[PDB]
């Protein structure tokens, strides 16, 4: 499923540095993580 | 088949196979509106069907909160990499991007409750009266002649919502208090104002107010507006099912 | 009486964010879309772990 | 409150949001407001710190740069759970902290 | 994160671009590394004003 | 020591467009591409629906008759709408439709300075039970502005405009017979059609010159 | 320019009496009877007191004579 | 649509070769943008002059030592690599030094090249060389295109910046710029910042309106 959609097989993408602009001499891993939202906000716990 | 889809209620038709002789098409479904849960979070039902489609037994018509188009859909997804970036994800921390605040992806809306009572004391009774002392222009502009803020008004931090005036007798006032009362020329009001307000850090918009009165007691005009809105909504859904 | 006040809370710096495999975390600030590293396709990364 | 990490701050300083910075420095802002000569009262001072005026941050930032604060975890484990830092003026509701502490 | 920075920063590499090169000083090496042609791990030679 | 002139705007779609200005020297192309993306992704003048007042429902949560979607869904569809404004900051728009038919973004009554881009974005679904009626008040902002920082029917919304979504830079090797390494850059500006990409580059040029005139 | 107590902690090696000395110096500064030696760098009297402690300009006998 | 114009308030100068400029009034996402762009245009490329060719006497390779110096020929080459040379007349000149502790001003030079760091020690007497400098816009390594060696043409030495939030009355989320620089001494820090930013001015000034 990684190799059929024009994506690298090990998740070893080649990324570009947005801050410094120097080319990374190492392949990185990106993707999509489905995360959750919690009932641990600041507004219900803030005591003023 | 589905005749008409509305966000308040949905109706479906009954086929000739799984039906009785009399009262063939009778199927109402009151969708849960924006009410209060137990942990002060909002709950609602969103329809995911169209007009002119057939359904089956046990089909999903309207999904609740954190459910979309028939399946459980709790959160959202975004592009995620594994990198310690500038100490923002220091040990196990998170570093977001401007897409989640610009597209309102992982934002959440809570429904905050505020229960105010209007009791009866031995020195003087209380009522929902809009004529409250120590009320400025910004507080009086939000509340009506009854004493309750209108449906859908912007509530800021430190706003008076409900109307509650309590009396007092033999307060033993200081000369400084009567001096500051006589300087401004205001009347010596012996009735205090114990109306509830919002806590610090809450600045939102109200959606509805629920009022309960005793049997054989005087009713507020805001209560009359609430019960007349509820009865015209009930008569509207009875008329549409008829 | 009881009034139902709805707060339109947004993303603020310091909210709680965890995934599905028990990785508790707190967001730091609202960093822009350019500071994150991007690939050659055109889609920059959003939430870096 | 809840904490978060701030990596752009030194060891001799930290971050702190203005919504709690208006109240944790309340006798200091009352003394500065009654000593500089803008408002000698305290009820108008409460009204101007609850009305979110524009000048409250300019008169409040004098006791942010060089004024210590204390911060303690509510589950206390050892003696390093309490600390001292220096706040700055940021936005939001939660507190940024030093990473290496 | 800081210890992975010191780990991936200081390394004994076999094959890289700029193997056997000479650096003038510490900040000249910082200029030469950030130019985009030098690697973070390479067998190089530099004097130190310690 | 050459200045980048005679740019070429390669428009391959209504969202994405390629622009290659000139091949730079050895080490300059990544620098100019990173600087241009760092300034273009920061803040661009876009437009979004910041205010919305409905005459059928008082607030933005309770449902009404005739509308299939929820009011949260219709305000999400309004804040997800791409709108183009030429020379006006605030303009009042209306929306009204009666009948059993769907409504798209072309059904909104535009003006001489109000232009609609998308036509496939479905606004809502109607029925024969009831109808809807609401007014749209949009504004042009610089950066992100929430409803908390910025009568009874006034309902505030957050500024959610996105003038640019997906950009990157791809370096190549060219030859114009003046040096050894000539690195040219390709910039895929993907926008929502609310503004011109060349005008966005000119706006970022004015921002960088107004920011570096002080130094 | 920064709050540094190491210049006194490496000099007196006590970490006890400088708290009382900076206490009396800050009280004399807030009372308005004694002028500070080092100039203000947009600070409170605490930073000036700890800087006068770490610089070695005020001592126990000097603060007792200034009282 | 009103943008905030930045104004230079203060400039903390501690020495002639190290300065620290700041920029208080900025927007939310423009401060880190301008700071990182300025750091990039100082680290990437800057037009200058540096030694691009070297030659030793009696040592063909870098491993062969010479006689007449308490240090090694490795130390002599690393000493001559650390010089700063600025010139504007010619493009490639060859410098010759013939001395039998030496200084940097003992090299035979004409009026075209201007020596700045003349107190830099090269060798220690206890010696002939042929150095050639050239103009370079970017970094020219030894692999791409003791004979060939590296060259540092940029007068800047170390760039660093930390951006933090400031005290803003009219707005909420606006951070300031703190920048620390160190140079070779041949150029002013603010003049080097201006001479690096003027190519960013010229690259998009004709396109702007």
CSV table of N, CA, C and O in Angstrom, one decimal, chain B residues 72-128:
chain,number,residue,atom,x,y,z
B,72,UNK,N,-18.1,5.6,13.8
B,72,UNK,CA,-17.5,6.4,14.9
B,72,UNK,C,-16.3,7.2,14.4
B,72,UNK,O,-15.4,6.7,13.9
B,73,UNK,N,-16.5,8.5,14.5
B,73,UNK,CA,-15.4,9.5,14.0
B,73,UNK,C,-15.2,10.5,15.1
B,73,UNK,O,-15.8,11.5,15.2
B,74,UNK,N,-14.2,10.1,16.0
B,74,UNK,CA,-14.0,10.9,17.2
B,74,UNK,C,-13.2,12.2,17.0
B,74,UNK,O,-13.8,13.3,17.2
B,75,UNK,N,-12.0,12.1,16.5
B,75,UNK,CA,-11.2,13.2,16.2
B,75,UNK,C,-11.0,13.5,14.7
B,75,UNK,O,-11.8,13.1,13.9
B,76,UNK,N,-9.9,14.2,14.4
B,76,UNK,CA,-9.5,14.5,13.0
B,76,UNK,C,-8.1,14.0,12.8
B,76,UNK,O,-7.4,13.6,13.7
B,77,UNK,N,-7.6,14.1,11.6
B,77,UNK,CA,-6.3,13.7,11.2
B,77,UNK,C,-5.5,14.8,10.5
B,77,UNK,O,-6.2,15.7,9.8
B,78,UNK,N,-4.2,14.8,10.6
B,78,UNK,CA,-3.4,15.8,10.0
B,78,UNK,C,-2.0,15.1,9.7
B,78,UNK,O,-1.8,14.0,10.1
B,79,UNK,N,-1.2,15.8,9.0
B,79,UNK,CA,0.1,15.3,8.6
B,79,UNK,C,1.0,15.3,9.8
B,79,UNK,O,1.2,16.3,10.5
B,80,UNK,N,1.6,14.1,10.1
B,80,UNK,CA,2.4,13.8,11.3
B,80,UNK,C,3.7,13.2,11.0
B,80,UNK,O,3.7,12.1,10.3
B,81,UNK,N,4.8,13.8,11.5
B,81,UNK,CA,6.1,13.2,11.4
B,81,UNK,C,6.7,12.9,12.8
B,81,UNK,O,6.1,13.3,13.8
B,82,UNK,N,7.8,12.2,12.8
B,82,UNK,CA,8.4,11.8,14.0
B,82,UNK,C,9.8,12.5,14.1
B,82,UNK,O,10.8,12.0,13.5
B,83,UNK,N,9.9,13.6,14.8
B,83,UNK,CA,11.1,14.4,14.9
B,83,UNK,C,11.1,15.3,16.1
B,83,UNK,O,10.1,16.0,16.4
B,84,UNK,N,12.2,15.4,16.8
B,84,UNK,CA,12.3,16.4,17.9
B,84,UNK,C,12.7,17.7,17.3
B,84,UNK,O,13.8,18.0,16.9
B,85,UNK,N,11.7,18.6,17.3
B,85,UNK,CA,11.8,19.9,16.5
B,85,UNK,C,11.9,21.1,17.5
B,85,UNK,O,10.9,21.5,18.0
B,86,UNK,N,13.2,21.5,17.6
B,86,UNK,CA,13.5,22.8,18.4
B,86,UNK,C,13.0,22.7,19.8
B,86,UNK,O,12.8,23.8,20.4
B,87,UNK,N,12.9,21.5,20.4
B,87,UNK,CA,12.5,21.4,21.8
B,87,UNK,C,11.0,21.7,22.0
B,87,UNK,O,10.6,21.8,23.2
B,88,UNK,N,10.2,21.9,21.0
B,88,UNK,CA,8.8,22.1,21.2
B,88,UNK,C,8.1,20.8,21.5
B,88,UNK,O,7.2,20.7,22.4
B,89,UNK,N,8.5,19.7,20.9
B,89,UNK,CA,8.2,18.3,21.4
B,89,UNK,C,9.4,17.8,22.2
B,89,UNK,O,10.2,17.0,21.7
B,90,UNK,N,9.5,18.3,23.4
B,90,UNK,CA,10.7,18.1,24.2
B,90,UNK,C,10.9,16.7,24.7
B,90,UNK,O,11.8,16.0,24.3
B,91,UNK,N,10.0,16.2,25.5
B,91,UNK,CA,10.0,14.9,26.0
B,91,UNK,C,8.9,14.0,25.4
B,91,UNK,O,9.1,13.0,24.8
B,92,UNK,N,7.6,14.5,25.5
B,92,UNK,CA,6.5,13.9,24.8
B,92,UNK,C,5.5,14.9,24.4
B,92,UNK,O,4.3,14.6,24.1
B,93,UNK,N,5.9,16.2,24.2
B,93,UNK,CA,5.0,17.3,24.0
B,93,UNK,C,4.6,17.4,22.5
B,93,UNK,O,5.0,16.5,21.7
B,94,UNK,N,3.7,18.3,22.2
B,94,UNK,CA,3.1,18.4,20.9
B,94,UNK,C,3.5,19.8,20.3
B,94,UNK,O,3.6,20.8,21.0
B,95,UNK,N,3.7,19.8,19.0
B,95,UNK,CA,3.8,21.1,18.2
B,95,UNK,C,2.8,21.1,17.1
B,95,UNK,O,3.0,20.3,16.1
B,96,UNK,N,1.9,22.0,17.2
B,96,UNK,CA,0.8,22.1,16.2
B,96,UNK,C,1.2,22.9,15.0
B,96,UNK,O,2.4,23.4,14.9
B,97,UNK,N,0.3,23.2,14.1
B,97,UNK,CA,0.5,24.1,13.0
B,97,UNK,C,-0.7,25.0,12.9
B,97,UNK,O,-1.8,24.8,13.5
B,98,UNK,N,-0.6,26.0,12.0
B,98,UNK,CA,-1.7,27.0,11.8
B,98,UNK,C,-2.9,26.5,11.1
B,98,UNK,O,-3.9,27.2,11.0
B,99,UNK,N,-2.9,25.3,10.5
B,99,UNK,CA,-4.0,24.7,9.8
B,99,UNK,C,-5.1,24.3,10.8
B,99,UNK,O,-6.3,24.4,10.5
B,100,UNK,N,-4.7,23.9,12.0
B,100,UNK,CA,-5.7,23.4,13.0
B,100,UNK,C,-6.5,24.5,13.6
B,100,UNK,O,-7.5,24.3,14.2
B,101,UNK,N,-6.0,25.8,13.5
B,101,UNK,CA,-6.6,26.9,14.1
B,101,UNK,C,-7.3,27.7,13.0
B,101,UNK,O,-8.2,28.4,13.2
B,102,UNK,N,-6.7,27.6,11.8
B,102,UNK,CA,-7.3,28.3,10.6
B,102,UNK,C,-8.4,27.6,10.0
B,102,UNK,O,-9.3,28.2,9.4
B,103,UNK,N,-8.5,26.2,10.1
B,103,UNK,CA,-9.6,25.4,9.6
B,103,UNK,C,-10.6,25.0,10.7
B,103,UNK,O,-11.6,24.4,10.4
B,104,UNK,N,-10.3,25.3,12.0
B,104,UNK,CA,-11.1,24.9,13.1
B,104,UNK,C,-11.2,23.4,13.2
B,104,UNK,O,-12.4,22.9,13.4
B,105,UNK,N,-10.1,22.7,13.2
B,105,UNK,CA,-10.2,21.2,13.1
B,105,UNK,C,-10.4,20.6,14.5
B,105,UNK,O,-11.4,20.0,14.8
B,106,UNK,N,-9.4,20.8,15.4
B,106,UNK,CA,-9.5,20.3,16.7
B,106,UNK,C,-10.0,21.2,17.8
B,106,UNK,O,-9.6,21.1,19.0
B,107,UNK,N,-10.8,22.2,17.4
B,107,UNK,CA,-11.4,23.1,18.4
B,107,UNK,C,-12.6,22.3,19.0
B,107,UNK,O,-13.2,21.4,18.4
B,108,UNK,N,-13.0,22.7,20.2
B,108,UNK,CA,-14.1,22.1,20.9
B,108,UNK,C,-15.0,23.1,21.6
B,108,UNK,O,-14.5,24.2,21.9
B,109,UNK,N,-16.3,22.8,21.7
B,109,UNK,CA,-17.3,23.7,22.3
B,109,UNK,C,-17.9,23.0,23.4
B,109,UNK,O,-18.5,21.9,23.3
B,110,UNK,N,-17.9,23.7,24.6
B,110,UNK,CA,-18.5,23.2,25.8
B,110,UNK,C,-19.8,23.9,26.1
B,110,UNK,O,-19.8,25.1,25.9
B,111,UNK,N,-20.8,23.3,26.7
B,111,UNK,CA,-22.0,23.9,27.2
B,111,UNK,C,-21.8,24.0,28.7
B,111,UNK,O,-21.6,23.0,29.4
B,112,UNK,N,-21.8,25.3,29.2
B,112,UNK,CA,-21.5,25.5,30.6
B,112,UNK,C,-22.8,25.8,31.3
B,112,UNK,O,-23.6,26.7,30.9
B,113,UNK,N,-23.1,25.2,32.4
B,113,UNK,CA,-24.3,25.3,33.2
B,113,UNK,C,-24.2,26.3,34.3
B,113,UNK,O,-23.1,26.5,34.8
B,114,UNK,N,-25.3,27.0,34.6
B,114,UNK,CA,-25.3,28.0,35.7
B,114,UNK,C,-26.7,27.9,36.3
B,114,UNK,O,-27.7,28.4,35.8
B,115,UNK,N,-26.8,27.2,37.5
B,115,UNK,CA,-28.0,27.0,38.2
B,115,UNK,C,-28.2,28.1,39.2
B,115,UNK,O,-27.5,28.1,40.2
B,116,UNK,N,-29.2,28.9,39.0
B,116,UNK,CA,-29.6,30.0,40.0
B,116,UNK,C,-31.0,29.7,40.5
B,116,UNK,O,-31.9,29.3,39.8
B,117,UNK,N,-31.1,29.9,41.8
B,117,UNK,CA,-32.3,29.6,42.5
B,117,UNK,C,-33.0,31.0,42.9
B,117,UNK,O,-32.3,32.0,43.0
B,118,UNK,N,-34.3,31.0,43.1
B,118,UNK,CA,-35.1,32.1,43.5
B,118,UNK,C,-35.9,31.7,44.7
B,118,UNK,O,-37.1,31.3,44.5
B,119,UNK,N,-35.3,31.7,45.9
B,119,UNK,CA,-36.0,31.1,47.0
B,119,UNK,C,-36.9,32.2,47.7
B,119,UNK,O,-37.0,33.3,47.3
B,120,UNK,N,-37.6,31.8,48.8
B,120,UNK,CA,-38.4,32.6,49.6
B,120,UNK,C,-37.9,32.6,51.0
B,120,UNK,O,-37.8,31.6,51.6
B,121,UNK,N,-37.6,33.8,51.5
B,121,UNK,CA,-37.1,34.0,52.9
B,121,UNK,C,-38.2,34.6,53.8
B,121,UNK,O,-39.3,35.0,53.3
B,122,UNK,N,-38.0,34.5,55.1
B,122,UNK,CA,-38.9,35.0,56.0
B,122,UNK,C,-39.0,36.5,56.1
B,122,UNK,O,-40.1,37.1,56.4
B,123,UNK,N,-37.9,37.2,55.8
B,123,UNK,CA,-37.9,38.6,55.9
B,123,UNK,C,-38.3,39.3,54.6
B,123,UNK,O,-38.6,40.5,54.5
B,124,UNK,N,-38.4,38.5,53.5
B,124,UNK,CA,-38.9,39.0,52.2
B,124,UNK,C,-38.7,38.0,51.1
B,124,UNK,O,-37.7,37.4,51.0
B,125,UNK,N,-39.7,37.9,50.2
B,125,UNK,CA,-39.6,37.0,49.1
B,125,UNK,C,-38.8,37.6,48.0
B,125,UNK,O,-38.5,38.8,47.9
B,126,UNK,N,-38.4,36.7,47.0
B,126,UNK,CA,-37.6,37.0,45.9
B,126,UNK,C,-38.4,36.7,44.6
B,126,UNK,O,-39.3,35.8,44.6
B,127,UNK,N,-38.1,37.4,43.5
B,127,UNK,CA,-38.7,37.1,42.2
B,127,UNK,C,-37.8,37.5,41.1
B,127,UNK,O,-36.7,38.1,41.3
B,128,UNK,N,-38.2,37.2,39.9
B,128,UNK,CA,-37.4,37.5,38.7
B,128,UNK,C,-37.8,38.9,38.2
B,128,UNK,O,-38.7,39.0,37.4
